[PDB]
């Protein structure tokens, strides 16, 4: 087909219009607006670093589509896929559910107009048309009839009257939504008029006589979470299902090869459909078809996505729905199966302490907002109250107690705050309770500004392991650094020794059992008679400097040991044996995790998040909002200034929340950050390319209206 | 008198002969040359143990008088003898001078009219000259008569008026070349009048009434690599020549201590005449005089360029005529450079310590390998990566960090018995993959058998393992020789490679550990010079084979290991160079392929980052690896070409180099840890405002 040889040489996004049975490319400045008569196929290529490209199939069907168009667009993406050898992932899209990496394409906005072909209608590039503008973080212009019963006081419309453009904002619209549906009013200007055509924004009561003509006279006008962990696993064979899986997280080895199968997230408005390698051709082309009799058969919206991934091609939130999801290549190659587009343009930069100071973006990718070298105050919870820690001992912390660290941080030419919440595993509800007021009462004494964090032991973050100068981060079991009482330690005791992309090392205690070992890690186990150094496979440099640091402190002397050959009396100290971790980790966590961003609300009693499509931009961070960003290690609460104080104050629990849901069953431990709108910390602003400091020095609304 | 203050310290020193005398040229015109007169120029530089090294130049202008040459010849020979006849010797004409002479003078050098004769001296007053200013990398500005007839517009020129200096540019003169006449200005400036002037720059169309009233209204203004790879040797016996051997590589046997010998590199512009320790006193004392009437008598230009040099100070330009010389001499733009021996904990510190080792980092970056099936890349096994079969040919893209820096490196490796298809499609995939890339990833070919230390050193711990035959692709897998042997060499930071060889004893060597696989069992064996890492990496190998080493010494191995290799003879025992910064230092030519025809220009003395013009391809050769610097603005032909001007280069060396030897191309603004520090003095930041722009706001 002479659009198939077009079909994704070079990254870019091609849309093409189904019009009877043929695929017609549409005008690239008027890319995001759909006839919603009409089906449309949207393919998008992106560059996979080691220069390789990646394909998502998109075919998109309106709520006037025919079902012999949207026969054609499925036929199309089917044959597609098959002339670039099967390696893409497919996605249905229907008007208004559309999922977020379609509406990444298009932060612009989309646009819904009226017609198809059927009712002859073209994207040829006179008007009278009105839209209905509707969208916090996914901007959508339905075209509807010019009419005042169109219109409501809660949104934003546009009426198009072709070199003139009357953006109309409700009184009872917020202005936030105002700013984006300045975006669709700004769109048309410029891609369907070619910036010779005047844009004229109104509120309510100002009304010039352009629109009152057209309109007539203006008359009155009137004015989630818990459903994301479950899902299930079934295996397709008319066809019929069997469940091989009722709950997650699955087993990767469920998916076999040689058939096909459905990933259920129906109540959460997708399934997946995973195409196996050795599956026969017929079931394996008829996956969108599969995917429908499963949406009917469960009684499912019809507008359910739906998306076909081939295996050793899956994407990272399908395969977040099983357990420790690996590969061959894995720690080999240059990335993994797929690329999720929105951070498929971010240059990755690994760590160089010396240029630290230099670089959001090594902050971000790396957790580090500096070198860890700043002046800091260690308090333990004792009662109701901060007790100053020996400055002797910065460094070890013990499992019975909570602490609050602030520290000061330097990066670039700027000055900030971290308060760390430590919460050990064995304290006492109250001291933990009370750590996490004092540490509130603490922000407030310092202005509101400082970064929080709270951190659970054995889930340290990485910029905590690096303030405690060369030493290691010991963290024992353990009892209590109070001075009240030392307890007698146990009589063997093992440190599992960490490392970061700082060098900077700490030594958590577990429990003295072979199942505790790792490859990647050295280990220090202490017995009656001597002291161990077992140093792994993976195990590198500042592992095991930080293994004999701890070596010191503990009064005990190495006998060092590798890992596989080694002495049994080390293996009489543990009781026994069992297999351990050898599998490394991931360089790679940006590509099987990358960020998201979410906004999240509470009223209506219930829990509410909605994912920000595409690439992470500061424009996306509402005043009036709580916004997430989860990197894989630490999920950060962004607060924003004109929230409201309920949400604020539920900062840390909308976070508890939303990880609590995480299908993929995120450890409990995940360190949780608040941050406040304009003392963003180096790592959480280093993951958004065209960061401005002043960004909101001027209102973002007022900015784009006088600039146009 | 002068003899005496000869040579003592390293430094540089230049006489002017006047009449049959040596008078002391003022260091603040070390640069400046009488066409009438001759000069003697001696480069003192500290050899590299405490010892002095010595360059005896001298110089003829072109309307240097018969005896004026001659005394310069005489004290040349004198001066040699005062310093014990260990001094190289070397004869310069005006305008064909050699390449180390011109590295004492890279402001430039002015040929000035006038000669003890006509009454001219080095004073140091009312002036009107004008230079005309020629010359990329070698710049020469010769005195000119003050007429707008001197003035070409090609060219840049100088009128020098005493306080004020008017550097006049072409309309179509090369903005590199402005770059390089405003160097003269401003060395007139600030070693002429000591300051004490200004310098105004204009074009054509722009000059000054000063300049329009001194030349009046201006009017209408107008506008070899075959040659090195061979040579012949001679013996020298009136004097009359013996040819000894009429093509290189030489014996280096052939040079007997007590005859005299010529070096004929004539239709390349040099010959040498090397002098035997116990060559009789008269036969030496006349070297030049032998060399000039070997001149005469091949007819060569009376400009060819000669050197004699003392049995044991030879140059290594001199000794890579021969082949493996065994057994002084120190480039003197390699004199000053600081030799940083190998640690992996600094390596991201040290630009020069990856230049000097050819590592870019320690080689744990993220990298990605495929295998050439046809015309498709095809991802190797991850289990495998290490291993290279020598029927396949691959591509490797690897990511290096250095400093606080990122780069990447495409690395085509290509075996020796891949099919040309598949190697030529290997070579297109890397550049495709290349600009894929935005143009920037370095990209080094590599033959089998000839792998970069920096390859070596991706694999983890493990070695670098090379298959004679076969393929890793998935169509077919040979069952490999019975009896097989491998070469393991080890790099600078410890990183291992086994090359698998003929199963020969003359394919052993003294240097290395080797592993001979048999049927009934395996061997490593261990040499003299075999090191720590050698046997590690030897004996990972053993493990991939699938065998158990039984471990051998050299010297006293057992007979059972030599059945294995059909009998026993000599082989390789003889070490290698951190020596080999000195036998073969850095040079950087620059290199056109117009006219049908390859030529290159050596650039002159220290290696620094300006003379890497963007409207160049350079080459910068290492003796590991022959770098390809490419300019933003060179001609998109000769961009395209940058490997093929390479192994141009490479084939056309009198060295009679390896075939198989390394080519890295890399591009402005681009450049690896490795290329970058050899160029002391290199900056990040060079070409964000233009050379030109800043160096003609700079000073003005």
Aim: proline share 5%.
């Amino acid at each position: 087909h002479p659009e198939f040889l077009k079909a994704g040489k070079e990254p870019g996004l091609q849309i093409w219009r189904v019009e009877k049975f043929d695929l017609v490319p549409v005008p690239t400045n008027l890319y995001g607006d759909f006839f919603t008569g009409d089906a449309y196929v949207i393919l998008k290529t992106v560059q996979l670093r080691n220069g390789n490209l990646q394909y998502d199939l998109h075919y998109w069907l309106g709520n006037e589509c025919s079902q012999d168009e949207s026969g054609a667009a499925a036929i199309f993406t089917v044959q597609l896929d098959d002339y670039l050898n099967g390696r893409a992932v497919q996605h249905r899209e229907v008007q208004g559910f559309e999922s977020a990496t379609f509406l990444g394409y298009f932060k612009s906005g989309l646009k819904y107009k009226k017609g198809g072909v059927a009712s002859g209608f073209k994207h040829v590039v006179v008007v009278q048309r009105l839209f209905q503008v509707k969208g916090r973080r996914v901007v959508r212009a339905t075209e509807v009839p010019v009419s005042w019963e169109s219109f409501n006081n809660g949104y934003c419309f546009i009426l198009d009257l072709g070199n003139n453009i009357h953006q109309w904002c409700g009184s009872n619209s917020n202005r936030y939504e105002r700013l984006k549906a300045t975006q669709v009013s700004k769109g048309i200007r410029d891609n369907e008029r070619s910036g010779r055509a005047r844009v004229h924004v109104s509120e309510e009561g100002t009304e010039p006589e352009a629109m009152l003509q057209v309109l007539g006279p203006k008359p009155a006008l009137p004015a989630d979470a818990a459903n994301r962990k479950l899902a299930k696993l079934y295996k397709v064979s008319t066809m019929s299902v069997s469940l091989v899986a009722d709950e997650n997280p699955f087993a990767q080895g469920a998916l076999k090869s040689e058939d096909c199968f459905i990933l259920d997230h129906g109540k959460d408005g997708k399934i997946f459909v995973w195409k196996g390698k050795q599956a026969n051709t017929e079931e394996r082309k008829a996956a969108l078809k599969t995917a429908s009799d499963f949406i009917t058969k469960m009684d499912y919206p019809k507008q359910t996505q739906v998306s076909v991934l081939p295996e050793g091609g899956e994407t990272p939130l399908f395969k977040q729905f099983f357990k420790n999801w690996r590969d061959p290549d894995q720690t080999d190659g240059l990335g993994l199966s797929y690329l999720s587009s929105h951070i498929a343009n971010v240059e990755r930069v690994p760590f160089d302490a010396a240029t630290l100071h230099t670089s959001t973006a090594m902050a971000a990718q790396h957790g580090m907002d500096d070198d860890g070298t700043g002046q800091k105050q260690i308090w333990r919870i004792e009662g109701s109250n901060k007790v100053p820690v020996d400055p002797a001992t910065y460094g070890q912390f013990y499992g019975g107690d909570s602490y609050i660290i602030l520290y000061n941080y330097r990066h670039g030419g700027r000055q900030g705050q971290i308060i760390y919440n430590w919460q050990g595993a064995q304290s006492t509800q109250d001291e933990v309770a009370a750590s996490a007021i004092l540490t509130a009462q603490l922000d407030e004494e310092l202005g509101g500004t400082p970064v929080q964090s709270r951190v659970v032991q054995g889930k340290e973050p990485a910029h905590l392991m690096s303030l405690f100068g060369g030493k290691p981060m010991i963290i024992y079991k353990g009892g209590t650094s109070r001075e009240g009482g030392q307890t007698a330690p146990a009589s063997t005791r093992l440190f599992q020794v960490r490392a970061n992309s700082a060098g900077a090392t700490r030594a958590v205690e577990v429990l003295p059992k072979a199942g505790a070992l790792n490859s990647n890690d050295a280990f220090v186990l202490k017995t009656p008679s001597a002291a161990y150094l077992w140093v792994g496979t993976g195990a590198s440099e500042a592992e095991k400097t930080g293994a004999q640091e701890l070596l010191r402190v503990l009064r005990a002397q190495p006998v060092q040991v590798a890992e596989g050959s080694e002495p049994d009396g080390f293996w009489e100290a543990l009781g026994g044996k069992a297999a351990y971790r050898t599998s490394p980790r991931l360089d790679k966590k940006m590509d099987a995790h990358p960020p998201r961003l979410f906004a999240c609300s509470n009223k209506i009693g219930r829990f509410v998040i909605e994912e920000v499509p595409g690439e992470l931009m500061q424009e996306d961070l509402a005043t009036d909002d709580v916004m997430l960003l989860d990197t894989w290690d630490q999920v950060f609460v962004w607060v924003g200034k004109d929230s409201q104080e309920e949400e604020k104050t539920e900062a840390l629990t909308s976070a508890k929340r939303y990880i609590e849901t995480d299908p993929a069953n995120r450890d409990r431990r995940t360190p949780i950050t608040v941050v406040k709108q304009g003392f963003e910390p180096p790592s959480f602003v280093g993951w958004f390319l065209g960061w401005d400091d002043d960004y909101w020095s001027v209102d973002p609304l007022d900015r784009a209206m006088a600039e146009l």
